[PDB]
Ligand code: HEM
């Protein structure tokens with residue numbers, strides 16, 4: 049006899065388990081068990097992932113309901129799961145999004161300079177270098193500090209909350225509350241800080257004093273800075289790191305982008321499509337009985353949308369395991385989600401990786417793993433799959 053199939057299948061972000069294809073072919077929606085012991089539906093075909101993400105009756109908000117089947121424990125106050133709905137209601141949606149485009153003046157030059165300088169330093173210290181801790185993460189952290197308008201020097205302390213903040217835990221994490229509360233006081237201080245006038249926090253400080261926002265709470269303003277810092281640094285640093293590994297593992301692809309750097313955008317778009325950085329399916333709670341393939345999902349039940357199920361579905365991406373820079377549907381992957389909660393930092397996520405890859409390829413054209421790929425240590429019980437250290441030589 050066997051327990052119900054458990055998720056996640058594997059912390060490894062350098063290979064998709066064979067089980068995913070088997071599941072997608074035989075059972076594109078099946079019952080699994082999460083780390084909390086709750087039952088959920090795993091959706092692993094493009095068509096069904098797309099359906100669940102586009103049907104708002106599969107609610108993100110409701111996952112936070114007391115007594116709901118859970119993927120993992122909340123690392124935030126329950127009202128913060130409705131973050132984007134709260135931002136929408138307070139009239140802050142247009143302002144938040146305009147503040148987080150890679151289109152801001154001199155932001156790209158900032159990324160480029162920062163990536164180059166992180167890289168010059170690696171080269172000066174000599175190989176082996178750690179591309180996660182000493183390149184991709186400081187790059188992400190530096191980008192979000194610039195973007196928020198906060199001092200660069202504050203980034204590493206805020207960054208160190210993230211190994212806890214993005215845990216995927218069966219149980220509540222005392223440390224997450226500590227960090228959350230601390231980082232919220234930090235962001236509040238920043239709203240009251242007369243020198244913080246640029247980026248997202250500079251803008252939020254203005255709107256805060258505007259009579260049109262007089263009834264928006266201080267908690268929400270601080271929450272926006274903590275959440276956008278955390279979600280963004282975690283997501284871009286994780287993505288970049290594992291996209292480097294895929295790049296490294298493909299010297300032919302790396303050559304091509306080195307010769308023809310104008311293909312880098314088309315490359316990152318494939319790197320996003322194939323990325324395994326999201327460790328768990330996207331959770332949603334059925335607010336009604338909804339047919340999904342052969343299964344009638346009952347109101348109250350948890351549904352997990354498996355992003356690599358969609359992104360490696362051969363019915364939508366032929367030869368899905370393969371990076372092809374000339375697919376006719378290149379950006380239709382679900383790497384940023386789909387429908388109501390589509391990632392608001394997608395343009396920023398894209399530029400960060402394009403530039404980080406671009407600079408890496410110029411400075412380190414012979415970049416290569418300095419250990420066998422199996423030696424990478426994968427972070428467990430975490431909402432991203434990342435190698436703890438990315439040791440490389442060049
Ligand atoms: C390449 C980097 C990134 C990847 C792969 C990525 C992935 C995603 C995905 C798949 C979702 C949808 C989650 C869901 O529907 O449950 C999402 C939502 C979100 N992301 Fe991004 N993301 C990235 C960069 C960013 C950046 C740069 C920011 C902002 C600085 C950001 C902040 C958010 C926030 C606040 C949400 C919630 C959207 C909502 O609830 O309506 N992430 N991220």
Ligand SMILES: NC(=O)c1cc(Cl)ccc1N
Nearest residue numbers: 209213224227228275278
């Ligand atoms: N800074 C934090 O501790 C934190 C950040 C996010 Cl984005 C989510 C949960 C957290 N505890």
